[PDB]
Design an enzyme around this catalytic site. Sequence first.
Site, short mmCIF file in Angstrom:
data_model
loop_
_atom_site.label_atom_id
_atom_site.label_comp_id
_atom_site.label_asym_id
_atom_site.label_seq_id
_atom_site.Cartn_x
_atom_site.Cartn_y
_atom_site.Cartn_z
N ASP A 1 0.81 -1.21 0.00
CA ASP A 1 0.00 0.00 0.00
C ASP A 1 0.85 1.27 0.00
O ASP A 1 0.59 2.20 0.77
CB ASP A 1 -0.94 0.01 1.21
CG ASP A 1 -2.06 1.04 1.08
OD1 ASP A 1 -2.20 1.63 -0.02
OD2 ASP A 1 -2.79 1.25 2.06
N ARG B 1 -0.79 8.92 1.34
CA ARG B 1 -1.49 9.00 2.62
C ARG B 1 -0.77 8.17 3.69
O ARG B 1 -1.02 8.34 4.88
CB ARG B 1 -2.93 8.52 2.47
CG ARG B 1 -3.05 7.03 2.19
CD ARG B 1 -4.45 6.67 1.73
NE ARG B 1 -4.81 5.29 2.06
CZ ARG B 1 -4.69 4.26 1.23
NH1 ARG B 1 -4.23 4.43 0.00
NH2 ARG B 1 -5.04 3.04 1.64
N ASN B 2 0.11 7.27 3.25
CA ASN B 2 0.82 6.40 4.17
C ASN B 2 2.26 6.85 4.41
O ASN B 2 3.04 6.14 5.04
CB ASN B 2 0.81 4.96 3.65
CG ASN B 2 -0.57 4.32 3.72
OD1 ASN B 2 -1.36 4.65 4.61
ND2 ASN B 2 -0.86 3.41 2.80
N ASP C 1 2.94 3.93 7.66
CA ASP C 1 1.86 2.98 7.95
C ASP C 1 2.10 1.64 7.26
O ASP C 1 2.53 1.59 6.10
CB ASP C 1 0.51 3.54 7.49
CG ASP C 1 -0.63 2.57 7.73
OD1 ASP C 1 -0.89 1.70 6.87
OD2 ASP C 1 -1.27 2.66 8.80
C1 LIG Z 1 1.67 15.50 13.59
C2 LIG Z 1 0.85 14.76 12.60
N1 LIG Z 1 -0.13 15.43 11.91
N2 LIG Z 1 -0.82 14.68 11.04
C3 LIG Z 1 -0.26 13.48 11.17
C4 LIG Z 1 0.80 13.44 12.13
C5 LIG Z 1 1.63 12.27 12.51
C6 LIG Z 1 2.97 12.35 12.94
N3 LIG Z 1 3.74 11.27 13.29
C7 LIG Z 1 3.19 10.01 13.22
N4 LIG Z 1 4.00 8.91 13.58
C8 LIG Z 1 1.85 9.79 12.80
O1 LIG Z 1 1.44 8.46 12.77
C9 LIG Z 1 0.10 8.06 12.36
C10 LIG Z 1 -0.09 6.62 12.88
C11 LIG Z 1 -0.09 8.13 10.83
C12 LIG Z 1 0.89 7.50 9.99
C13 LIG Z 1 0.78 7.54 8.58
F1 LIG Z 1 1.71 6.96 7.82
C14 LIG Z 1 -0.30 8.20 7.96
C15 LIG Z 1 -1.29 8.82 8.76
C16 LIG Z 1 -1.20 8.80 10.19
N5 LIG Z 1 -2.24 9.45 10.91
N6 LIG Z 1 -2.46 10.79 10.77
C17 LIG Z 1 -3.49 10.99 11.59
C18 LIG Z 1 -3.86 9.79 12.19
N7 LIG Z 1 -3.06 8.81 11.76
C19 LIG Z 1 1.09 10.95 12.45
#
Ligand SMILES: Cc1n[nH]cc1-c1cnc(N)c(O[C@H](C)c2cc(F)ccc2-n2nccn2)c1
Length: 287
Positions: free
Chosen positions: A146, A150-151, A167
């Site tokens: 994937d 977005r990841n 992710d």
């Molecule tokens: C600050 C900040 N603002 N917006 C995002 C962050 C952020 C910083 N560091 C991370 N480690 C993180 O991890 C999550 C699991 C994640 C990993 C991914 F690949 C894609 C999306 C998400 N996501 N975004 C919101 C909820 N889930 C998010």
Amino acid sequence: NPNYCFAGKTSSISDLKEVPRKNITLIRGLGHGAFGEVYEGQVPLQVAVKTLPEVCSEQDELDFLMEALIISKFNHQNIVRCIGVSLQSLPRFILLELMAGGDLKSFLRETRPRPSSLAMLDLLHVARDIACGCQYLEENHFIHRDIAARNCLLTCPGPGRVAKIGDFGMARDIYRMLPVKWMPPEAFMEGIFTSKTDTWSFGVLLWEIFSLGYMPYPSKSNQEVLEFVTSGGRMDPPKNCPGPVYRIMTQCWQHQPEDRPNFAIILERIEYCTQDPDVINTALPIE
Ligand SMILES: Cc1n[nH]cc1-c1cnc(N)c(O[C@H](C)c2cc(F)ccc2-n2nccn2)c1
């Protein structure tokens, strides 16, 4: 307790670094992604806190544990670090490196040039960063499944930003809704996944990057994309995209897996693009 193997080595939940719950403070929400809510937190070390809903099936809990094991086992600068976990208190936490730049798709959307800034070189550095992460996965025989904007995450908004794969939810599901717009034919037709699966997806990520965060195959639904790609259709170049960059894309989208470049080759071509004045002097569109 469920097992996990990476680079040969086997690990279990016992190998995860448990952080004392008392040492963990939540700061603010960052949003949730189907699995549950994610918070900014501190352990002081800044962390992103992935939570497991206390109301979940045992299958959700297994998925959660597996994700923890997968990310903890990686060691590479373009894959988000796991600081640890807190599994002995509810709700259960996975603690990740806080990437202050947020996710790549939203960054591209919010940071695109306007009359009120980004250059080709910034996009190429992001592309290189993720390609380097993918190369590390490829050489360790891990198929992400994937690869998509977005990841991916960014360490910061500014020029020194580093992009990382953040992710691994799809890989976790398969290890034990489909991202068809990121999938090669053999994948969504035959369910065949190989290192060349990620090469195709990376081509789509590249398009996302140089389009500055547009949804792939604009105006097409999943099934139309399925039919389009199966019949040999491919995306047009993003607006103002240099031909050398577009040609990396079209090579990533070769129908035969064996005709698609491995990531060492992709990194070479990305490097060449960054050296080429006619590429990096090309201005991005201003909306
Ligand atoms: C600050 C900040 N603002 N917006 C995002 C962050 C952020 C910083 N560091 C991370 N480690 C993180 O991890 C999550 C699991 C994640 C990993 C991914 F690949 C894609 C999306 C998400 N996501 N975004 C919101 C909820 N889930 C998010």
